[PDB]
Design an enzyme around this catalytic site. Structure first.
Site, PDB file in Angstrom:
ATOM      1  N   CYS A  58       0.812  -1.318   0.138  1.00  0.00           N
ATOM      2  CA  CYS A  58      -0.077   0.151   0.100  1.00  0.00           C
ATOM      3  C   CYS A  58       0.852   1.281  -0.015  1.00  0.00           C
ATOM      4  CB  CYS A  58      -0.887   0.051   1.303  1.00  0.00           C
ATOM      5  SG  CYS A  58      -1.483  -1.622   1.751  1.00  0.00           S
ATOM      6  N   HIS A 108      -4.320   7.456   5.055  1.00  0.00           N
ATOM      7  CA  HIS A 108      -4.337   6.023   4.469  1.00  0.00           C
ATOM      8  C   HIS A 108      -5.740   5.585   4.396  1.00  0.00           C
ATOM      9  CE1 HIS A 108      -2.751   2.236   3.525  1.00  0.00           C
ATOM     10  NE2 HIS A 108      -3.429   1.820   4.837  1.00  0.00           N
ATOM     11  N   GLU A 144      -4.915   5.215  13.096  1.00  0.00           N
ATOM     12  CA  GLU A 144      -4.344   6.398  12.196  1.00  0.00           C
ATOM     13  C   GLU A 144      -4.793   7.672  12.798  1.00  0.00           C
ATOM     14  OE1 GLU A 144      -4.946   6.396   8.038  1.00  0.00           O
ATOM     15  OE2 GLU A 144      -3.330   7.913   7.650  1.00  0.00           O
ATOM     16  N   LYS A 155      -9.767   7.067  -0.579  1.00  0.00           N
ATOM     17  CA  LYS A 155     -10.145   5.768  -0.681  1.00  0.00           C
ATOM     18  C   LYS A 155     -11.699   5.791  -0.510  1.00  0.00           C
ATOM     19  CE  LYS A 155      -5.637   3.614   0.319  1.00  0.00           C
ATOM     20  NZ  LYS A 155      -4.864   4.733   0.778  1.00  0.00           N
ATOM     21  N   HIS A 215      -8.889   1.341  -2.825  1.00  0.00           N
ATOM     22  CA  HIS A 215      -7.506   0.976  -2.530  1.00  0.00           C
ATOM     23  C   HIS A 215      -6.711   0.743  -3.627  1.00  0.00           C
ATOM     24  CE1 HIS A 215      -4.143   0.341  -0.353  1.00  0.00           C
ATOM     25  NE2 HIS A 215      -4.258  -0.474   0.406  1.00  0.00           N
ATOM     26  N   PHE A 266       0.939  -3.452   3.886  1.00  0.00           N
ATOM     27  CA  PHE A 266       1.149  -4.691   4.742  1.00  0.00           C
ATOM     28  C   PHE A 266       2.526  -5.048   4.856  1.00  0.00           C
ATOM     29  CE2 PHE A 266      -2.551  -4.647   1.964  1.00  0.00           C
ATOM     30  CZ  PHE A 266      -3.713  -5.052   3.005  1.00  0.00           C
TER      31      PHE A 266
HETATM   32  K   LIG Z   1      -2.653   9.012   1.737  1.00  0.00           K
END
Ligand SMILES: [K+]
Ligand SMILES: [K+]
Lengths: 420, 420
Positions: B170, B311, B321, B342, B347, B406
């Site tokens: 990611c 994220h 986060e 996202k 994603h 990951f």
């Molecule tokens: K980002």
């Protein structure tokens, strides 16, 4: 930029499951290349590979179980295991097992692979087709992602610094080391594990490289003679396997703790051919720029070079690199030794640049240039000493290592004896 | 270290085949998420994805044929084609088409992917088993290697500078941009194409991520509502696809040629969790370190931050986060807008960090923070503005973007409006 030194070595190779036995055997003129017996290759044009000697861990053999539990091994492709094993070695060699927050946070990991979990992907594909999606392992994805070598290593040792990965085919291991060194120089880490890993000895990979006609095919019954860089009778590379990891460390950090320093990394150069997806540039211009860039970063004149570890995969391109090196060295050609250790351990793909970096470090330690095995009849005469057949004992203080990967991705590294 | 600016943007996304139409639809609150119709998903628990709108190239659609010949497309996995298309856009935007030796040699490419050619590997596996090794394509290997994105792009445009590639799940696209910027800062290149690409919408990948229960499953009948970062009813991420590429350029080089400058890259931070192969640190400590590292490098105080691109994948980790960001921002939390895009495009895996960097750049250009779609009922209350539902027009000069992959591989980037 802070100075960066090498304080630990780890290697799982077709010659041995550790560094010192790999080196011993390399210098004795041994080959890791043999007929594949682990699976069916009767229908392949290439039936040989450079394989890690498996066993109980004695006499230089490799025992996977000592590095990862059996049940855990079944959740990952072999490239991850090899990386864990090489890391185990490296950390031990450097005597670096960070426990404190400070120590863990400043220690990172940068391990690459060219191909990663190709075997596991194919096997999962069969499961999916034959048994359906409900039979796909929860571990399919992590056990197959290239960056999970860095991930698994990081987790095992509590390494909480930069966690990163690269993928550049044959130059993977070299990029890994160069990039990791820059992280340290820039202050993002004080210690890095860096290198490459590959487990490409499987049917899918062999068929794939055979399909683009990249592999040796004419010496299936004489495996130890197949890999012959520079030789007029070469006919393609011999695929190898393994992992090579070094511990990189900021100089003052190393000095402070009394670490043994093997060598200093002082140069890193990158370029691109922009020519062809698998064939190297006919002009060798990319290779040349890579080398010059590395030397310039290192502030090293070619007048100072002692040994070059070639890319030299035993393909027709061998002589393109040779000509490029001749151009780089000019007047100094007759005083530099250059060899390809792929003559002994085959082409480790993603791990190649790292294993060769290791060999370079040990060349400095032991003042000896590894041989180019099988070099009976050079395709072209050159003033460069290609160290045919047997290693050459000589002064080696400054070294250059080349890695030229599929896609036209070039990397060169320069390392030197540490005095201060 | 030389200063580095962004002078070109390119994007193939689930909203549109180009940058401006992607941005336009993003701000309009459009979703790229829909039921999958291209292949059978009836036996899969997740039947939705964020897919690129395919067409003749008009009205914001994507036509692969305009970027690579049909016959050539058949030789590569789609991640390579997306990358080419994004690169095509970015170079055009930057008005940079090097022809001289000088200009070509100083322009490199660094494009990553998280997963690469997984679909093609599985298909070749079936061929291997059903038809035999003889039937494997000579193009199997090159069309499948992650680094061949950089390779193909390099060849197309004669880019002979550093040719490199990364793989960090990611956070791939973020690492790529940060790494490419450093190459420029260090003098290794004057111009770099950098970013990420991914083509993960296939049965094997869907089965794989489903198996580790990473994917949304309860909204297959209401796709546009599935991706809901921070929302109490979130149940996993929605897989997307595409490529995002930026042209990075040394400041003085940009100024001298009169290039339009979108923003400056001023910070880059890296860390590792060392926690778990797929799950993020429960403590968010790694994330926190990454952010702090980027901000320190940028010499930016949190009091100056305007917008954060999270994220935020729509997983339970979203609030980890969130908490980490709150700790970083402290007293200044109320001043900052943070959103996950996202929520709109899913994603993008390897491409996520680059696509999001692009959104950051445009957030600066247009002084507007993208929304977090579908944020009906936040799991926790926060002083941070999560920009629910609709974008928020506001002063945006300094931005931070997070990518947490990951394997526990974290990256953060800091960018800023260019004045001089
Ligand atoms: K980002
Ligand atoms: K080498």
């Amino acid at each position: 930029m802070r100075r960066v030194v090498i304080t630990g070595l780890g290697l799982v190779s077709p010659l041995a499951g550790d560094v010192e036995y790999s080196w011993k055997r390399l210098l004795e003129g041994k080959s890791g290349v043999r007929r594949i017996t682990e699976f069916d290759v009767s229908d392949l044009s290439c039936q040989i590979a450079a394989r890690i000697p498996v066993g109980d861990g004695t006499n230089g053999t490799y025992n996977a179980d000592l590095h990862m539990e059996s049940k855990e091994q079944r959740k990952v492709d072999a490239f991850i295991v090899y990386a864990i094993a090489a890391a185990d070695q490296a950390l031990a060699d450097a005597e670096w097992f960070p426990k404190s927050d400070e120590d863990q946070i400043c220690t990172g990991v940068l391990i690459g692979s060219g191909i990663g979990g190709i075997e596991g992907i194919v096997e999962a594909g069969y499961t999916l087709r034959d048994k359906g999606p409900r039979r796909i392992s929860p571990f399919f994805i992590p056990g197959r992602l290239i960056n999970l070598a860095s991930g698994y290593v990081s987790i095992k040792y509590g390494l909480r610094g930069p966690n990163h990965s690269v993928v550049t085919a044959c130059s993977t291991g070299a990029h890994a080391i160069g990039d990791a060194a820059r992280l340290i120089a820039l202050g993002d880490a004080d210690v890095m594990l860096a290198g490459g890993t590959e487990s490409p000895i499987n049917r899918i990979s062999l068929a794939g490289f055979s399909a683009c006609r990249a592999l040796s095919t004419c010496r299936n019954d004489d495996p130890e003679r197949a890999s012959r860089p520079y030789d007029v009778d070469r006919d393609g590379f011999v695929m190898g396997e393994g992992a090579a990891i070094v511990v990189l460390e900021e100089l003052e950090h190393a000095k402070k703790r009394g670490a043994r320093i093997y060598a200093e990394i002082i140069g890193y150069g990158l370029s691109g051919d922009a020519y062809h997806i698998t064939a190297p540039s006919e002009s060798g211009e990319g290779a040349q720029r890579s080398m010059m860039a590395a030397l310039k970063r290192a502030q090293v004149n070619v007048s100072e070079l002692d040994y070059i570890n070639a890319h030299g995969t035993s393909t027709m391109a061998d002589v393109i690199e040779l000509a490029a090196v001749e151009r780089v060295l000019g007047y100094y050609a007759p005083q530099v030794s250059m060899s390809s250790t792929k003559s002994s351990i085959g082409h480790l793909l993603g791990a190649a640049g790292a294993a060769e970096a290791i060999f370079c470090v040990l060349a400095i330690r032991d003042n000896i240039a590894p041989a180019t095995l099988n070099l009976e009849n050079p395709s072209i005469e050159t003033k460069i000493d290609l160290v045919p057949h047997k290693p050459r004992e000589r002064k080696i203080d400054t070294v250059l290592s080349n890695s030229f990967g599929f896609g036209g991705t070039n990397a060169s590294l320069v390392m030197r004896r540490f005095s201060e």
